[PDB]
C-alpha cells in the first residue's frame, strides 16, 4: 500500500507532471468517473469510468461518494475514493490534482494522504521558482498561497521551500520517500 499524494501551492502542477513522467513505476494517476461519452481513442476503465447516468452521478456527488467532483464543458467529472484506493494497492503513489478540501476527505476515508504545501517566502520568491509566470500572475499566486496556508495549515504533512524549482522538486521527492 502506497500513500496518495496531494501537492499544493505554486509550481504544484509542474511538480505533479515531473513526478509522473520521471518516475512512472512509483507514481500514478487514478481513473476518474465521467458522464461524457467515450470517444474512439478512449477505453473504459483506463481513460475514465464512463457513467451512463448523469442523475445517478449527481446523486453520488451529493452523497459524498467522490473526494472531488466538477463540471467541465457540460460533463461531470468525479474522483472516487475507490479509484484512489485502487492505485494505492498496486504500490503506486496516486498523484492527485485536487482541491485542499479533498485532503480532509481523504483523511476521513482512511487513505492517509501525504499533503505537501510548497510555500513561497516572498512575491519575488514566486518569480524565482516560477520563472514562467508573469509579474501580474506571480503576484496573485502569493495571495492564493497565503490564504491557502492560513486555512489548511493543519492539513499539511510537510511544507517545502526553495529559491529554484530544482530545489523544491528535489525536496518534494525527499518528503515523499521520508514519510513512507
Amino acid at each position: 500500500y502506497a500513500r496518495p499524494i496531494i501537492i499544493l501551492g505554486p509550481t504544484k502542477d509542474r511538480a505533479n507532471d515531473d513526478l509522473l513522467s520521471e518516475f512512472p513505476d512509483k507514481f500514478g494517476s487514478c481513473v476518474p468517473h465521467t458522464t461524457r461519452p467515450k470517444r474512439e481513442y478512449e477505453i473504459d476503465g483506463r481513460d475514465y469510468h464512463f457513467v451512463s447516468s448523469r442523475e445517478k452521478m449527481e446523486k453520488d456527488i451529493q452523497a459524498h461518494k467522490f473526494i472531488e467532483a466538477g463540471q467541465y464543458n457540460s460533463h461531470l467529472y468525479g474522483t472516487s475514493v475507490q479509484s484512489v484506493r485502487e492505485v494505492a494497492e498496486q504500490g503506486k503513489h496516486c498523484i492527485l490534482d485536487v482541491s485542499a478540501n479533498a485532503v480532509r476527505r481523504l483523511q476521513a476515508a482512511h487513505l492517509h494522504p501525504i499533503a505537501i504545501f510548497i510555500r513561497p517566502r516572498s512575491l519575488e520568491n514566486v518569480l524565482e521558482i516560477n520563472k514562467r509566470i508573469t509579474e501580474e500572475q506571480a503576484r496573485k499566486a502569493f495571495d492564493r498561497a497565503t490564504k491557502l496556508e492560513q486555512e489548511f495549515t493543519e492539513c499539511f504533512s510537510a511544507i517545502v521551500e526553495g529559491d529554484s524549482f530544482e530545489e523544491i522538486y528535489h525536496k518534494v521527492k525527499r518528503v515523499i520517500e521520508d514519510l513512507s
Binding site: 502542477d13 507532471d17 512512472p24 494517476s29 476518474p32 470517444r39 474512439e40 481513442y41 477505453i43 483506463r46 481513460d47 475514465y48 472531488e68 466538477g70 463540471q71 467541465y72 464543458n73 467529472y77 490534482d97 485536487v98 482541491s99
Partner: protein
C-alpha cells in the same frame, strides 16, 4: 506508372499530415513521433493488379517514449487528425485552469493507443 504517381502523391500527403500531428502532439505535451513507412494492405493482394504494379501505400509509424511503437494506416492518421485539431482548438480556447480542466487535457490522448 499510374500506381507510381498515385503512391507518390500519397507519400506527399502523408509527409505533411505526420508533420501536423507531431506539432499538435508537442503543443499538448504528449510528445509522439510520426514517421512515414510503407505497408502492403490485403486489398493490394486481392486486387489482382497488373504485374509490375507497386503494392505499397503509406503507413504511419507511431512512437512514444517509454511506451513502444505502433503502425497506423494513413486513413487512421487522417481521421485522428480530426480529433487532434478539435482537442487543440479546445485547448487554445479554454480559459479555465481548474483541477477538472487540467485533468481533462492531461488524460485526452488521441495521439497514441495504449492497446492493453
Amino acid at each position: 506508372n499510374n500506381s507510381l504517381m498515385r503512391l507518390r502523391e500519397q507519400i506527399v500527403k502523408a509527409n505533411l499530415l505526420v508533420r501536423e500531428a507531431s506539432y499538435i502532439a508537442e503543443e499538448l505535451d504528449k510528445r509522439t513521433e510520426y514517421k512515414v513507412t510503407l505497408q502492403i494492405p490485403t486489398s493490394s493482394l486481392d486486387a489482382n493488379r497488373k504485374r509490375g504494379s507497386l503494392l505499397s501505400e503509406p503507413a504511419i509509424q507511431v512512437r512514444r517514449k517509454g511506451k513502444g511503437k505502433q503502425i497506423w494506416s494513413l486513413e487512421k492518421l487522417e481521421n485522428r487528425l480530426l480529433d487532434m485539431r478539435d482537442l487543440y482548438q479546445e485547448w487554445k480556447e479554454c480559459e479555465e485552469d481548474s483541477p477538472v480542466s487540467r485533468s481533462y487535457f492531461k488524460r485526452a490522448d488521441p495521439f497514441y493507443d495504449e492497446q492493453e
